[PDB]
Amino acid sequence: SRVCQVTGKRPVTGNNRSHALNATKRRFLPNLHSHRFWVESEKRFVTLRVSAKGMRVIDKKGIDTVLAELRARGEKY
Amino acid sequence: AVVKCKPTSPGRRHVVKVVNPELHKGKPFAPLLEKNSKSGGRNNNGRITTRHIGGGHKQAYRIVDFKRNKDGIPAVVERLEYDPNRSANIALVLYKDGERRYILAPKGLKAGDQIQSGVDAAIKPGNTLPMRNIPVGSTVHNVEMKPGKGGQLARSAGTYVQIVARDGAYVTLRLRSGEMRKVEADCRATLGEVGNAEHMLRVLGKAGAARWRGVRPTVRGTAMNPVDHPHGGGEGRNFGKHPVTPWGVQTKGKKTRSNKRTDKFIVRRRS
Amino acid sequence: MRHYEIVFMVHPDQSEQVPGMIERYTAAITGAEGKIHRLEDWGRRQLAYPINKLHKAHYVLMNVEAPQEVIDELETTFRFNDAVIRSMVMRTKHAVTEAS
Amino acid sequence: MQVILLDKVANLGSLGDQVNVKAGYARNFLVPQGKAVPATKKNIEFFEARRAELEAKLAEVLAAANARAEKINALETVTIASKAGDEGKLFGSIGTRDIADAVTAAGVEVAKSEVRLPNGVLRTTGEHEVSFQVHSEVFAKVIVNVVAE
RNA sequence: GUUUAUUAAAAACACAGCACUGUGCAAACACGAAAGUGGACGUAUACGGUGUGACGCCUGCCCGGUGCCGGGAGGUUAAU
């Protein structure tokens, strides 16, 4: 499904309020992208479907810390 | 030839049969046949998607060799067979090494003609070669889209593509409908026009030729209901609307060509 | 056999490859069992009008007695080649000699 | 970005600059090719004494070793004698694979990815100039002689 | 030939034929939040939609309104 691997983002539900305040249920979807990371601790390619906010988090942190968090949460990498 | 039948009964008057006397009357080569299960226009979900098809006579799939992966090997055309899933005839060809394959039969082909394949192929029709040894301005068919794909364009009865321009590694082709487009020069093509050019001349005579082929009768929009079609209704042959599809999309002029990926390849649109 | 007066033009950097084409064409002539009469290479000179640009093309006359099957094959080797531009084959008229 | 650089980038890299670049140039080009390391409070300490003092001169002598790898083949010519067509019109166009195999079998042992062809796939039979990317500044002048057979 | 099984078998529906329109293949269109399928293991002598309904004679005028297509000079134009 559309679950981010790092940040754990999932689609939620909201209202599509128009000018006449007509409540219509729609779905908020995250900006998920499947990017291929070069890992130096593993020296290989890791394909992750993550959000771009998660990409900024990985840009801040180290990639080994992110793989350690995925190992602690039991996710496959 | 093209023989018009005599009106021996109501139904045989408009039957115009395209009878090719050079076709082989017998069973085809059995290891090149596989099963072709009918679908009736239904997807994996079981609902109908492509309407107005279904029924008709059974057929088996013939494995026709598209890529022509053999290079530098002479080929002697054994016989000609009728492929029920196509509009033109196919050719059973015995190669030099003893491998029998189905290919697309061109126009100038009879039993006993010799063809070949590869980059050392000649300009004689029936040979399959890439688009960098062909003289610019001739007639080719079985046009590949990508190098190694097998061939997507110019494969129905009578359909041919004329080479117009050669811009480096690009080949600018004029298609049958008149749409100028560029392809890769490394793609392969088979020289000549595709045979059975009289196949358009069959007018099928009766409803039964539509029924046993797989063409189901089509219901007009005026004969339907307003819940069934956007048209219809009224107290006696009332149309009063604009021509649309049954799913609300406008027809009789609407450009739905929108992919934005192969627009670089297209040079001039269809006119 | 009939006398055939072949005239063809060649592009210059491919006119550097003319004598090999002459050897191939006279091998076809030897296969035709006819004798060659005019090996006079007219040469690279100026054109009168733009014929498929980079001017000053290469004129070659052949003028050989040949049958019809060999001249049909040798015309198909002409029309299916990017090297040979404007070849032509003419009548017999008791084939001819020097002072072109 | 606070990304410290390692390789001599031909625009802004001068072995130790902190020039601000976009994230797409660092994450997709600099990091997976080993060109630069993102510096956030610890890689600065890694580059301060362990990398700029020893490993920069190691990268310089590896560039000199690449120059020597260019200087392996003193002949700097390849005579291809493959099968050709009749009076020109070569049979098969030679890509980077056969050129790389001919240089590797006798001469420079550089890989296929550094081989560049300025004149296309070399359909014309004759003398051709082929340059190699053994170094970002010093280039090769290999004279390939395609010979018709 | 088919149709309102259980008041309407018909001039109704449908029909081969004819015309318009879209589509150069990962095609259009359709089912499906999506994957994936049908179309099609077909590909412009093919497929889908529309209008009419063998055959002979044919199909005249109008782009004012609406629908479709093209061109972006100019006016207006949200989100940032």
From Swiss-Prot, chain A:
Keyword 4Fe-4S part of the UniProt annotation: no
Domain of life according to the entry: Bacteria
Gene Ontology process terms (BP): cytoplasmic translation; ribosomal large subunit assembly
Protein name from the UniProt record: Large ribosomal subunit protein bL28
Originating species: Escherichia coli (strain K12)
Keywords, ordered alphabetically: Ribonucleoprotein, Ribosomal protein, RNA-binding, rRNA-binding
GO cellular component, one term: cytosol
Paired cysteines (S-S): none
Annotated family: Belongs to the bacterial ribosomal protein bL28 family.
Record carries keyword Metal-binding: no
GO molecular function per UniProt: rRNA binding; structural constituent of ribosome
Subunit: Part of the 50S ribosomal subunit.
Database matches in Gene3D superfamilies: Ribosomal protein L28/L24 (2.30.170.40)
Curated annotation (Swiss-Prot), chain B:
Molecular function per GO: RNA binding; rRNA binding; structural constituent of ribosome; transferase activity; zinc ion binding
CC per GO annotation: cytoplasm; cytosol; cytosolic large ribosomal subunit; DnaA-L2 complex
Pfam families registered for this protein in UniProt: Ribosomal_L2, Ribosomal_L2_C
SMART domains: Ribosomal_L2, Ribosomal_L2_C
Ranges of compositional bias, category Low complexity: 38-47
Keywords in alphabetical order: Acetylation, Ribonucleoprotein, Ribosomal protein, RNA-binding, rRNA-binding
SUPFAM superfamilies xref list: Nucleic acid-binding proteins, Translation proteins SH3-like domain
Residues the record lists as N6-acetyllysine modifications: 241
Region (Disordered) residue spans: 27-52, 220-271
Taxonomic superkingdom: Bacteria
GO terms under biological process: cytoplasmic translation; negative regulation of DNA-templated DNA replication initiation; ribosomal large subunit assembly
Subunit: Part of the 50S ribosomal subunit. Forms a bridge to the 30S subunit in the 70S ribosome, contacting the 16S rRNA. Interacts weakly with S6 in one of the 3.5 A resolved structures. In pull-down experiments interacts with CedA.
Matching NCBIfam families: rplB_bact
UniProt family annotation: Belongs to the universal ribosomal protein uL2 family.
HAMAP family linked to this entry: Ribosomal_uL2_B
Miscellaneous field: This protein can be partially replaced in vivo by its H.marismortui (HmaL2) or human (L8, from the 60S cytoplasmic ribosome) homolog.
Protein name, per record: Large ribosomal subunit protein uL2
Swiss-Prot record, chain C:
GO BP term (any one): cytoplasmic translation
Keyword Translocase found: no
Sites bearing N6-acetyllysine, chain numbering: 93
Domain of life where this protein originates: Bacteria
PTM info: 5 different forms of the protein, varying only in the number of C-terminal glutamate residues, were isolated. The sequence shown is form bS6-6, which is the longest. The first two Glu are encoded by the rpsF gene, the other Glu are added post-translationally by the RimK enzyme.
Keywords linked to the UniProt accession: Acetylation, Ribonucleoprotein, Ribosomal protein, RNA-binding, rRNA-binding
GO-annotated cellular components: cytoplasm; cytosol; cytosolic small ribosomal subunit
GO molecular function ontology, one term from the record: structural constituent of ribosome
The keyword Ribosomal protein appears for this protein: yes
Family listed: Belongs to the bacterial ribosomal protein bS6 family.
Subunit structure: Part of the 30S ribosomal subunit. Interacts weakly with uL2 in one of the 3.5 A resolved structures.
Function: Binds together with bS18 to 16S ribosomal RNA.
Protein name listed in UniProt: Small ribosomal subunit protein bS6
Organism: Escherichia coli (strain K12)
Gene for this chain: rpsF
Full-protein positions shown: 1 to 100 of 135
Swiss-Prot record, chain D:
GO terms for cellular component: cytoplasm; cytosol; cytosolic large ribosomal subunit
Keywords on record: Acetylation, Ribonucleoprotein, Ribosomal protein, RNA-binding, rRNA-binding
Modified-residue entries (N6-acetyllysine), positions: 89
Record PTM N6-succinyllysine, positions in chain: 71, 83, 112
Claim: rRNA-binding is one of the keywords in the record: yes
GO biological process terms, semicolon-separated: cytoplasmic translation
Gene3D superfamilies assigned to the protein according to its UniProt record, in alphabetical order: Ribosomal protein L9, C-terminal domain, Ribosomal protein L9, N-terminal domain
TM ranges: none
InterPro entries associated with the record: Ribosomal_bL9 (IPR000244), Ribosomal_bL9/RNase_H1_N (IPR009027), Ribosomal_bL9_bac/chp (IPR020594), Ribosomal_bL9_C (IPR020069), Ribosomal_bL9_C_sf (IPR036791), Ribosomal_bL9_N (IPR020070), Ribosomal_bL9_N_sf (IPR036935)
Keyword Transport: no
Purpose of the protein: One of the primary rRNA binding proteins, it binds very close to the 3' end of the 23S rRNA.
Known partners and oligomeric status: Part of the 50S ribosomal subunit. In stalled/collided disomes (pairs of ribosomes where the leading ribosome is stalled and a second ribosome has collided with it) bL9 in the collided ribosome contacts bS6 and uL2, while it contacts only helices of the 16S rRNA in the stalled ribosome; the inter-ribosome bridge thus formed is different from that formed between normally translating ribosomes.
Name under which the protein is recorded: Large ribosomal subunit protein bL9
The species this protein was found in: Escherichia coli (strain K12)
Protein's gene: rplI
